[PDB]
Symmetry: D2
């Protein structure tokens, strides 16, 4: 347990006050992180804007080199970092190390994607004959200062997924990790520091959201806000952003539509893996099964068999189901479970809770009057909602305020594509669980699920603008 | 003078209350536009969302046919529409007709640009070997209901520049013109009505900002806000946008940097043309001259002689300088002229005001102490600021809160490019006035100049999103 | 009614001292004559084209597009007039011939709008080495120069315009050499461009005997690009005569229809027959061999047989499904394939009949790969059904062909169909539908002997443009 | 010291019954020997490549990229080992030879990362016709098959890797035929791919005598694509042997450097001399004629003269600017161009000397269009200065050449330079800098006799790929 420091203008800085961070699964004290003041935030942003001029005028090759070096150090330190990440957010140990490796893969991919950035030459003669000698040389430029806010459930992966695309394009960056997860974000920062990233190009901010939460987002120095977290926090960010560009990755309630001709064994396998991965603490998780009545009984029984095999225990033992992030999270999940039971749902697996470790709960015969049909639990509970027509399944799917992803299980792929067109989501996975991977694919959501398009090349594009130079050929 | 009506769900609807419109130059009564209630706004949006489903399922070529017919109708009625448009916002008669013709060019170009919408196919094997059989089919979709808000100084051109890109992409649209400029916006709507646009696919809103101003923007049926107007109004819109995507075309203070090796006569021609067009009531217009001392005196003389040749009079006579949009506008410009005179600027041309018809005022020896060096006048007044180094011109240029376009006048193009890379603007014009065109080129502004990227293909991309369908090849 | 037709040369209409009489293949009716150009007259066409190139490539895209749109308008106006003669010249159904002219106008309009929004690119030296971070490349599109467009008899207007309009929008000049059978239809298409006001020499035509100018028009150093549709052997020859100059070749095919056990057999049969016997099978893109899993072969053969029996057999003016073949050699060849299959023991499910060069549609079942009909492109109304017992065997037999234009897969398992498509050596695979070139914005290409280059509108434009790079250092 | 080298054949190293001994062109030193393959041994190379193609193209992009990155890493490691031998083999400066190997590694790495993230497209039938609005085309990239790569003596590693890496990342298999003079350097490159673990048959080498296998390796049916850099006459012969198969040719140049009256003459002279005399002028891309406005010609000539007189002349081991030319025939040819210019009255501003095949750098002024040096590519250290009176004249003379690779424009008026560039019949125009292929992400192409196809990394990958369309109807 160390006293961790922020990276500020090439230096490691403590603050007057600090926040002690405990392992959710064991209460073990892991260390402290600084409680930055609003003025300390100003200093970070000031250092970053000063470094921006020299950073954006480097070559793409040179900026890519730092990112590649940082990714190499992350791979080297994957076990060290993953061990601490595992404790900090109660994530299975092996899964935590895999998160660090995936972050390195994304950083390397972003570097090589961004370095081949291309512009366009537009012909005035495409629009009016009199301007045929006028051409526009359109080149990309960084937006400036990117504020990256990562989430507790991917405190390294969804930090690097923001940082690396921003840096390659010439942006400078300030990372605000979640307090629960700030140790992991600082451990990611060290790899960038050791890679030699110039002073102020990349910095970190830590503190409680009461002191600095709104402040870091409102600050006029910030040119882009890239956030992953809860919908209510993300909606608040949208207001404070003003005219500034944003990327928001918010909640989800992904539907898994199972038609009558589906491969029920494949459906059940994917639904359980996607729904209960990391105890259901993921935006891109199967969170409601919309199953045609004719196959519902059998599908529910095969899902139940797989849920009962999920291990329930501690992160260090690589348990499928680990304790939730904090007591409020599990209290909210328990309330949803109770509301379903009170309204008549069938508990195919039994609710149990020891501390914040909730056993995986599978409900059948869930109806739309139950909170569990709509509210995102961020816990290990899955509702099965029976439907009688595919039109009903589409309407119930679309009635959700969320629209991140959806799955369609069916052997009729032309019909599945037609269904996909009508779903109000970013991505539809056919005969597979929802997921944001592979990380080159676009990742986005409709409605309250957020704004902007992620995925590596899409993040790069989102965090750049264009500069047009127009002249007349003579 | 007639009673004008809003296009709502295929019918021309009146309101209980109405607003009488008068020509700003003559006081002639041109007619009345409806003063909608919030309930009538609700009905407009309900019609749009109800028409969205059928509209988005049409083929691209079917949507393009409506736009082509609307543009053909505008060309037919260009004289008729321009004649009234000239009265409504005191634009030169010939320039008003040219606006309508240009709008049709944009509408046709948008139709053909958008109908060739392509998707992309991404390989899971680009990122990891285990996903080589997984591919993503990424296709474009509309964002939903687009609220289009046009400006008084281009009430047709910068209405159609938003409507056509939206429509071709399968969005539905509600056009909120400015009250002064609503007749022209409704005349534009007639062209779309006569083209047979399905009921609810395109609608108009008119009314008072105090009743429906914020209501139309914050309404939850609106999925995209596309606005051109003043920077304080745009800032208000960004706050009300929340998470929803926006496009804002706000103010400008475009600088014209004139170096020592410049063609001073050519610079003066372009500077005067760009600065005093439509009496300076344009966001993209030379609004300040940053000239090196050595050539300042000769440049000022060449600019002065050209300002003296500008005609000053009534729109129907095609005067270069016409009466400003309203008395508040002229009052504000008079105050900037007075503040510069009182601080010691040399008026190379005489300030004369007759009603709201202000004569073109050219100031020399302007300094950063004066309001005219920074504030956007939206009137026929042009400051000349002398600088000693290129670094000083760049610093003064970027110190503005606006960053729309810039002009560089020089014979050294490699140097001009290096300067353009440092200017915080969307577009840099070499040896030419700042201008929005050609309409296929990107049009964007940095800082308080707005958000998002316009130009035809860029507009279409902004007002679409993507839908990814992922599946495994077997 | 048998007019004497003229070539469009540098804005003028020119006869030649000798001529070639064109006869209707279905009736023998004399339709007119076309000039038999000398090599010296070809020289004049090419000299006029290169002269016009300088002023044509320097027009704006908008100006070039306006000419194309006008020409397409005129084609739509005269679609009945032109289709009436096209039908006679190549013995194509009257309604089909008119539809060809309409489809050509749609391609021309689409090419103009596709080509005018062509874009360049800006590349960063700093993408590759830090020392060149201030060096940028401004890359803009340019035409290749003079494009020789050679159209085919089976689409003498459609696959003339598919070359002319993409070439013209990008700033190329064009010379159209139709086939003798199809030259009248090509000159009628030329009328529309002339009336559209296309500048003198920007678009020209050439007609003549192959023994006089056949190789000459290709070997001429004035030609910078050859865009050809026709037979494989004739296309192979052009490949040698082209030298280093770029080419596009649209040659023959032997498209396979793979029918799996889970396929909708009735739908598969409908698509197979429509694609196989359209225009009497005289189409490079067309189902020319059914590879059917044995479990469903009997039912599929029965479904196909009943449709083939319903095909009409008659004259172009009657819009018969099966019209007379292009000439006597073509019909003899088809009869030879029919006789080899019969002699080797194939089952004729429909009756062979021949009146002149009008061959009735022949469906064969139980075809084996020792039969010529299994491999050789007939360009006639005959279709073999070949039974297989595994998908792997169907893939091997499909890929053993020297042709690789398109393939159809009929199945309800689309993930599997995609895996099969990855292994098929073809340009395009159609799922639960017949092979086809359309829609004309899609890519159209063949592997192996089926051709060279990628067509479809935007792809055809890219093939007939090059790049001009301007590199400078920012200071 | 002199080693016996072997070809890489299906993952094994093979000798041949006969071999070819390679000697250092600067010293006559015996460097080693390479096999003299027979036609049957060529058959075995191509058969092994075609067998490996199926397994190679079904790998993921990342897997293929990993092999390329490993090979480059090995190349950087052995850059001094390989550079030292390359220096001797083609009489290139020792330092410049090592740099060529390093640049090859850089190009290989760039091609790996460029190729792995190439994408397909989804096209809408509803863009062309309403009735097809539910039909979509899923268009993905596929390799062309076996790529024959032919590298040149002047860049035997760099312009081998510029073909091998783009070909491989796209899923093609490759056979590399280096030039005899340069075959050792080509086989040393092959070792780096072998040590990287490239699967057997995916990459192979061929060496032999042109009189034995010269045409055979190109005419072979197994080859699906020929990618060649070398002389124009050799490249012309490849075009006809290629048939319908796609090709890329990098041939000769006669790049003009147009110097206008407002140009910085001192900077123009520096760039002209560095470009014209690099590697003794043995480069297709290189200033080979100066077209200078007569008002500044006198001052430019003296500025060029001063720098030419400073160039070092000597052995590769000493890193001289001017090294011995590749062989005697090449020096004889350059001497004949120098003599023709002298005999026709040109002014020699620097003296002509020839030690063996080491020719001193000759600058000629007052060169006229009747002199062979004004037109013919010397591939030697001689540079003509040609005085013009108008920019129009400079454009005309430039465009009269049968070569059209690149051109330089030296001036302060960039809008005018851009207008001049549009009129130049070349691939790339450099403003106020020497002509050059780099940076290697930029397009590299030539007009007229200067080649065919567009090079540069991403352009090379696109040229050696095709498309596979899968079309279906949404329900």
């Amino acid at each position: 347990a160390k006293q961790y420091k922020n990276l500020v203008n090439g230096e490691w800085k403590l603050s007057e006050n600090e926040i002690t961070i405990y392992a959710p699964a064991t209460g073990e004290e892991l260390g402290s992180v600084p409680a930055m003041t609003q003025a300390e935030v100003d200093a970070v942003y000031a250092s970053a804007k000063k470094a921006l001029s020299d950073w954006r005028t480097l070559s793409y090759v040179e900026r890519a080199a730092y990112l590649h070096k940082a990714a190499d150090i992350l791979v080297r330190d994957a076990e060290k970092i993953g061990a601490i990440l595992s404790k900090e957010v109660a994530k299975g140990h092996k899964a935590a190390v895999s998160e660090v490796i995936r972050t390195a893969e994304i950083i390397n991919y972003a570097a090589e994607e961004g370095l081949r950035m291309e512009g366009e030459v537009l012909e005035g003669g495409s629009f009016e004959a009199a301007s045929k000698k006028k051409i526009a040389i359109v080149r990309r430029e960084p937006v400036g200062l990117v504020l990256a806010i990562s989430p507790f459930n991917y405190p390294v992966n969804l930090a690097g997924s923001k940082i690396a695309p921003a840096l390659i394009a010439g942006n400078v960056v300030a990372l605000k990790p979640p307090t629960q997860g700030s140790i992991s974000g600082l451990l990611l920062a060290e790899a960038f520091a050791e890679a030699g990233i110039p002073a102020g190009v990349f910095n970190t901010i830590t503190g409680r959201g009461s002191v600095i939460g709104d402040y870091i987002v409102e600050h006029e120095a910030v040119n882009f806000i890239n956030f992953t977290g809860s919908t209510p926090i993300g909606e608040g960010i949208g207001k404070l952003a003003g005219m500034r560009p944003i990327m928001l990755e918010l909640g989800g309630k992904d539907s898994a539509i199972v038609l009558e001709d589906a491969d029920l064994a494949l459906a059940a396998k994917n639904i359980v893996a996607g729904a209960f991965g990391y105890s259901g603490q993921r935006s891109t998780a199967v969170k409601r099964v919309l199953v045609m009545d004719k196959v519902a009984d059998q599908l529910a029984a095969e899902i139940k068999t797989l849920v009962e095999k999920l291990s329930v225990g501690m992160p260090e033992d690589d348990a499928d189901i680990t304790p939730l992030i904090d007591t409020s999270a599990a209290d909210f999940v328990e309330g949803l479970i109770k509301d379903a039971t009170d309204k008549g749902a069938t508990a195919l697996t039994a609710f149990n809770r020891e501390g914040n470790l909730i056993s995986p709960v599978l409900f059948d015969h869930v109806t739309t009057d139950m909170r569990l049909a709509w509210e995102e639990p961020f816990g290990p509970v899955l509702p099965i909602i029976r439907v009688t027509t595919v039109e009903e399944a589409i309407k119930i799917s679309n009635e959700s305020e969320y629209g991140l992803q959806a799955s369609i299980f069916t052997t009729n792929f032309p019909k599945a594509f037609g269904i996909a067109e009508q779903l109000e989501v970013g991505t539809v996975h056919l005969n597979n669980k929802t997921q944001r991977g592979t990380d080159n694919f676009p990742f986005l959501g409709a409605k309250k699920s957020g704004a902007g398009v992620q995925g590596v090349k899409y993040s790069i594009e989102a965090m750049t603008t264009v500069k047009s130079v127009v002249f007349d050929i003579q």
